Amino acid sequence: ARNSVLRGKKADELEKVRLRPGGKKKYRLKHIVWAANELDKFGLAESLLESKEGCQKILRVLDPLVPTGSENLKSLFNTVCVIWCLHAEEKVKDTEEAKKLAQRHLVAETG
Amino acid sequence: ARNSVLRGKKADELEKVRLRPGGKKKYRLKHIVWAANELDKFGLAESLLESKEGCQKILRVLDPLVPTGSENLKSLFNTVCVIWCLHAEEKVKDTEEAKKLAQRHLV
Amino acid sequence: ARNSVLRGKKADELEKVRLRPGGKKKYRLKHIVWAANELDKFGLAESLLESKEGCQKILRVLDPLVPTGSENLKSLFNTVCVIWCLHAEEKVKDTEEAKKLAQRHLVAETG
Amino acid sequence: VLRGKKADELEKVRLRPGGKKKYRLKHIVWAANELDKFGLAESLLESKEGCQKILRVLDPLVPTGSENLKSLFNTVCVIWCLHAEEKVKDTEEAKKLAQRHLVAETG
Amino acid sequence: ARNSVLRGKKADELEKVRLRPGGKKKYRLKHIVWAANELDKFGLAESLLESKEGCQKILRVLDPLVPTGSENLKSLFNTVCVIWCLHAEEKVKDTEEAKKLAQRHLVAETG
Amino acid sequence: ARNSVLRGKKADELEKVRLRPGGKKKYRLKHIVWAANELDKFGLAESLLESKEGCQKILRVLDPLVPTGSENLKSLFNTVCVIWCLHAEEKVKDTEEAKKLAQRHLVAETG
Amino acid sequence: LRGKKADELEKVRLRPGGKKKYRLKHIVWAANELDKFGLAESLLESKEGCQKILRVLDPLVPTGSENLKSLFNTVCVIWCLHAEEKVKDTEEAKKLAQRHLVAETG
Amino acid sequence: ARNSVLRGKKADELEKVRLRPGGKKKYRLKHIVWAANELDKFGLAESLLESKEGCQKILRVLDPLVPTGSENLKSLFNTVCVIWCLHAEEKVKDTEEAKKLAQRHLVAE
Amino acid sequence: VLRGKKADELEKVRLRPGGKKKYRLKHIVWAANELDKFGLAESLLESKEGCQKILRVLDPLVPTGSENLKSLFNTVCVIWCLHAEEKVKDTEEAKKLAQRHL
Amino acid sequence: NSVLRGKKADELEKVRLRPGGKKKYRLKHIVWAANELDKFGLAESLLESKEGCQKILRVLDPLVPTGSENLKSLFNTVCVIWCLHAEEKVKDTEEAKKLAQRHLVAET
Amino acid sequence: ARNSVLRGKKADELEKVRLRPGKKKYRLKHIVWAANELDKFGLAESLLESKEGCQKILRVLDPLVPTGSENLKSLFNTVCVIWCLHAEEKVKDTEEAKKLAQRHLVAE
Amino acid sequence: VLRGKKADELEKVRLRPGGKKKYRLKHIVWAANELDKFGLAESLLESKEGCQKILRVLDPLVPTGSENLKSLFNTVCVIWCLHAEEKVKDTEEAKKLAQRHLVAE
Amino acid sequence: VLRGKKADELEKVRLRPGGKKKYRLKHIVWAANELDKFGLAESLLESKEGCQKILRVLDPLVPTGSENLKSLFNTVCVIWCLHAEEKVKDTEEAKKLAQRHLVAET
Amino acid sequence: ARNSVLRGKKADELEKVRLRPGGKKKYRLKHIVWAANELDKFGLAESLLESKEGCQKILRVLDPLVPTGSENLKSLFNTVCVIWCLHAEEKVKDTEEAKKLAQRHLV
Amino acid sequence: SVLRGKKADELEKVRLRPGGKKKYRLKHIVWAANELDKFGLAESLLESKEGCQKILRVLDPLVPTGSENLKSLFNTVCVIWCLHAEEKVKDTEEAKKLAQRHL
Amino acid sequence: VLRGKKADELEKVRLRPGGKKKYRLKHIVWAANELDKFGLAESLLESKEGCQKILRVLDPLVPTGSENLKSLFNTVCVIWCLHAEEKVKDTEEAKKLAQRHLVAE
């Protein structure tokens, strides 16, 4: 359920994150459920969205598939990055800002 | 707190309510916070948004003010109408379907 | 898997929490696995331990059951309280300090 | 059960947080008769401690319970605050206080 | 994702079970989605719906609450009985027929 | 908890399946726990081992990695094949026999 | 890989704390293993061709055989030679090249 | 970080190894942290605890000092002996069995 | 200035966004006499409106302000959130909530 | 439950909990004290005067030597409140506990 | 010069902004007036040439705005207009330009 | 900014009313870069009139200003006295002479 | 890449005109990484002449250039200003001076 | 007075703490008074000896002086470490065990 | 309680600064008393010329690297000592000299 | 004076606990010129051993020390963390570790 992933202030913080750097379209609750059903399509547990570590576990798995990834894959990656910034409570203003902060953690923990 | 007015499934159903009957733009949690601060601008205690009876009280304060109301007020009356149906668990797909169910109760 | 719930510094910060307010016996890695399998007996998802919101959800469910609860029930309650203090980055010295900050959060969100 | 000042104060507690309807004597008559369905002694409603015992018995069913079990649960919370002599304007505020005391006492 | 709970012949057969013993409106896919999202609230895993053994586990946790539960809880209890008969490959015509079969196995499982 | 995967007759039947086509050492409860804890590393939900449809699902996610995977991974693949026939109510003498039955359903499922 | 880059490779350890260092036979085994994958062995001669090999192998590394990791490990070292990033063992090379993988992906 | 030395099943498997042969106390993550900090006194690189070969190299530099060494040295030596067994995945019950399995291997090479 | 619930709730607020040290009554006494130094009225600290009159006076002074003004502007931000009955967990959460209302 | 207000509430917060420490009394301690009193059947209004606090200390004094950690906390907090009501300046709990106890052993 | 503040593609956009929420739109002399008005403050005219420098003018002038003269208030609002153009935030008048430039000033 | 006889005369002015430390070239360089942080042109420090304009912009902020603002304000008062050729022995005497001219105009 | 006085003078040039955010080491690391996307040598950033090689290569791309290219050209302008012993307050003062020497020497 | 620092059961346990690690000659009552005398000379409040919080305050003053301190200071530092362990109700057997645990609480 | 009688009145004639009009008050003595309890020093040392000499002796090495809170305390105790020593100083810097010449 | 990796890693450490202003090169330039006012060897900042050698000398002076002294002590704690290969996040978390290594010594 959407209440399990993001809830309370974290949901309000999500809807202040823009879908694109300069755009005006912002994230909504439907993005949370879509990413969960996206994970369920590939056998990955939805419960990883509920933690910054589980989100980091999602990113480590999806990253070797991004180069050949579809639009759903390349964007599910971006949605998980947004969720990680909210679990880590890092103020990002857009998807590209979430990718910058989430992949910064991904680069650093690699190895 | 936004978590007060609508939360969980209520916050999910809210975002499934279109701003206009045929239109595609649906509600988002920003509209609850705006409608709350509209109550604060009126002196009305914001806590009326948390119950369908408190919302019904709001609709009674504003319904005389609608025929001459402005753009923000006709929208606030419409926003609290959607919040009422969500509290009342009456499924509406848009704004005018909510006013129809909420004002049918105001009778 | 134990690595899924508590990993890295969260596991080390766990092993500095006393089992009792003054005792020298501290929490170890076997307590994490025990609490996870304790939840599995009652149908509760193990993944709720992965986040402080899921831990708080565990506590809301277990709280009406504590007055007539066994030792494993109370031990599970106290262990989940410890995990919450680690997900919330709260420095507790023992179980009683964990239950203090965890139930103070449970009381505050009640209503 | 409720007599004198406790009955006057009960009829100042709203049935819903935003409504106008207040509690009446028939609400206590309904709760005591409902307690009979649980084998619970009706004299428990006459004390703070007896109310805490009803709530400890009813709590594991509240998230799933019927609106009748909830109405019973809500009423005992209101009766608790009267015995606790703590000001409550409506039902959900009495719920907030009674379950607050319930969670804290639990150890 | 509804695909996980019931798929294939099970998804097709679910829409042959009537909600009411004499009624005509049969089960939908949206009923599967609702029952799964209800389980996320008692902390119970959505995954128990994907197996008859997990459906029997749900009924064990739910039966103490049936005497004083909401019709929502009764609907979830009844739907889980229907999903169990689908997993168990037992042919049922309506909800209360699956209710009797899932409970007959639940009662025979007692103790 | 081993419980959730295989139980009762399934638990007694697993320990009759030979690890090797001519071997004598048969499957153990600990093999179920190991395979379950390996999926938690791949991000694959542990719950897919509780149903035959989730076992076919694990096989689909695992088969691309079999040509270049570790023997630890072949063991997870082979064990899922054994757990599948147990859920599928199909008799096998050994592991390679469970592979042929589970992969036959996997081949006929392709498409 | 030839001459100068071969000398630099032979100062890279097989394991982060071991004593054995990389030899000519390691490239011979790696290029021969690439043939089993259809990968052109000339890819090993460039930092860009090494990037291509690593992109192909990454979705198999967490599950891969000890033979697959040896190929992945050796190509990571060769990437660092072409990238001219001083690595003293296999772990530092893998850590460094996979680092470059994650940053480049988008 | 302690997480760099032992993690996952390795961190779990560590806490099954008994400390003293008969005693009830077992290894905690606190023992890896103490060891790792103890090597910073020697200048011995701390990343050596992450490898069985690195653990072997640790024992090599330490072995000339054990006959006369302090209990700090003895404790540090024995802890690395178990860490090597975990990297090597050679099962062990107490500190004595790990000392045997580590010091067989150091003498053989 | 405060009492009862508002006094207890003030003491539940963290000075810094992660510590354990919490607001106290001496902070209210300090902010009371800080207003009396700039000539402002102390009774503005009893309302969410008079509070934001102070917050309006101090905002164009924050980017160059000393630690006292920065703490005064921040303490008043916490007092406003108590008056506005909007729950905050630290000084900066009260800042983001008081300035949103500016 | 504005059990303490005025200068007394401000004076409560300059009293250190343990002798030699820096953590001083909060309002959450007065709230906690009145909550423990309700478990005894005592009146929360007893904390409003020095005389009503002496009623508490006289009921708790026989329990002090064997008292649980929560009882010693209650008795000691009431001693500080008694010092606040009796207008007695104290640095820490032991100083407040000493004066309230001496006044307790003196009226006999 | 007027050039170095707003130029070309953005000077055409400035001429679409109304002085009141009014028909008369902003001119080029409005940039020059605001620049030569900063000259009375000693503020650098180079601050008008970037959105970050425009916020710097707003910060310096905001303590004066509540008590500011008619020339004072105008300078602030015009700098708010220039910031909205530098920041590529369209604004149909001056009042909305004050809103967009001030909500950024308060946030930082 | 400040050179010639003015730089020599600046270094005869005490940092604090009666200390041993006096004004140095580091404070004018610091004041010039501080001015940059405010959007005020460093060229204002070159004249008494530019220093006069600096103080008018700063004076509203001195009751609440940080230590860097008060000290940046402090140095400018001394610089104004040098440009105006008025004998000053320390910062406070410069503050008194500068603010006196500030209020009178 | 840069050390001594130059590394300290770098951490003092403001990024945008009118801001506070000054250049950092991560900006030099980032610029050296984007250069390898062009085949240029990271060692070019170590002299005013080598940086002039970069500018002449990026100068024709500046007008239509992306945000990442403009940032690269601007960082190299700062580095050239450091090597050429030219004091600047922000990136814009730097491009001004480097581009003017870019136009003068043709 | 000696008894105001440690008394009774805690005074018995003090005499059961060895002066040196595996030693056998143990602490005395004169060690309490002599340590209070060292505080008097230092100007420190002798009152800090009577609580584990005041003892930790003493050791926070003495710890920077330990790397160069007199054997007198190391004696006072060790004595206060033992008195803290007695106050803190944390059983030790020698000075070195009290040091290892008073410094554990010194962070 | 530290300074009473002619000493407390003699204190309020000592100028806080060498040349200036603002002089010492009662709040400085109570503040100097709490600075002592912050360190753990005996508050009663302020009441004597020798107890004050115990403080200045301990604090004087801390002067070169100390905050002005310590310097204000070092100056206050320097002045408290002058009053106990019956040395009629007129300002703080006049007191530090006479006091440190006794160290 | 640090170099490359240590200098790059130093700039990922914030001054405030949860602030944003991260450490710069001039926080080392200030601390290097500050130690010379004690006579402590400037080169002690080049090693975790010399860093703890610094913290030993300064720790007695930090209860009463000015913020100039504390800023020196707190920066050295950050520098020791770099030589110890211990990823901290801010000054306080670095102050913690370098001080508890010192207390154990």
Side-chain angles (χ1 to χ4, degrees), chain H residues 22-64:
Chain H
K24 296 302 175 174
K25 213 149 212 195
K26 297 210 187 0
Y27 269 105
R28 283 138 181 190
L29 304 175
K30 178 212 220 320
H31 299 126
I32 275 174
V33 173
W34 186 81
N37 181 270
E38 280 330 275
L39 303 120
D40 266 14
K41 261 144 88 174
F42 291 51
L44 273 194
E46 207 194 292
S47 39
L48 289 180
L49 283 181
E50 318 183 23
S51 165
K52 59 165 179 193
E53 292 89 5
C55 281
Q56 293 255 263
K57 186 198 242 80
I58 279 181
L59 304 173
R60 235 170 272 139
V61 162
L62 286 194
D63 210 38

Side-chain angles (χ1 to χ4, degrees), chain O residues 31-47:
Chain O
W31 173 91
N34 296 338
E35 284 282 277
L36 292 188
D37 276 290
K38 163 189 298 304
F39 297 156
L41 279 47
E43 230 181 33
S44 266
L45 300 161
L46 292 173
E47 280 150 291

Side-chain angles (χ1 to χ4, degrees), chain O residues 3 11 14 16 20 22 25 27 46-48 52 56 60-61 65 72 74-75 77 85-86 88 96-97 100 102:
Chain O
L3 252 50
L11 169 68
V14 162
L16 293 170
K22 275 191 46 143
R25 279 186 114 84
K27 55 159 203 264
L46 292 173
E47 280 150 291
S48 101
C52 284
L56 292 189
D60 191 36
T65 37
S72 290
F74 176 81
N75 294 0
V77 178
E86 303 176 357
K88 223 187 292 162
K96 275 166 64 211
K97 161 220 279 188
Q100 262 181 321
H102 204 276

Side-chain angles (χ1 to χ4, degrees), chain L residues 9 20 34 46 49-50 53 60 73 82 93:
Chain L
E9 258 282 4
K20 286 222 318 189
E34 221 62 37
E46 292 160 10
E49 310 95 20
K53 215 166 303 185
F73 186 94
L82 306 147
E93 182 187 12

Side-chain angles (χ1 to χ4, degrees), chain I residues 59-99:
Chain I
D59 216 301
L61 303 172
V62 169
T64 60
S66 58
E67 291 314 316
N68 310 357
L69 158 71
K70 284 206 284 268
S71 266
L72 171 61
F73 182 92
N74 281 214
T75 288
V76 173
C77 278
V78 186
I79 301 175
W80 171 90
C81 281
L82 299 155
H83 287 332
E85 310 225 322
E86 313 263 62
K87 201 98 162 221
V88 316
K89 298 253 232 186
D90 41 62
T91 296
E92 274 78 323
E93 181 167 0
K95 218 151 73 181
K96 91 154 134 180
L97 209 42
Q99 276 142 340

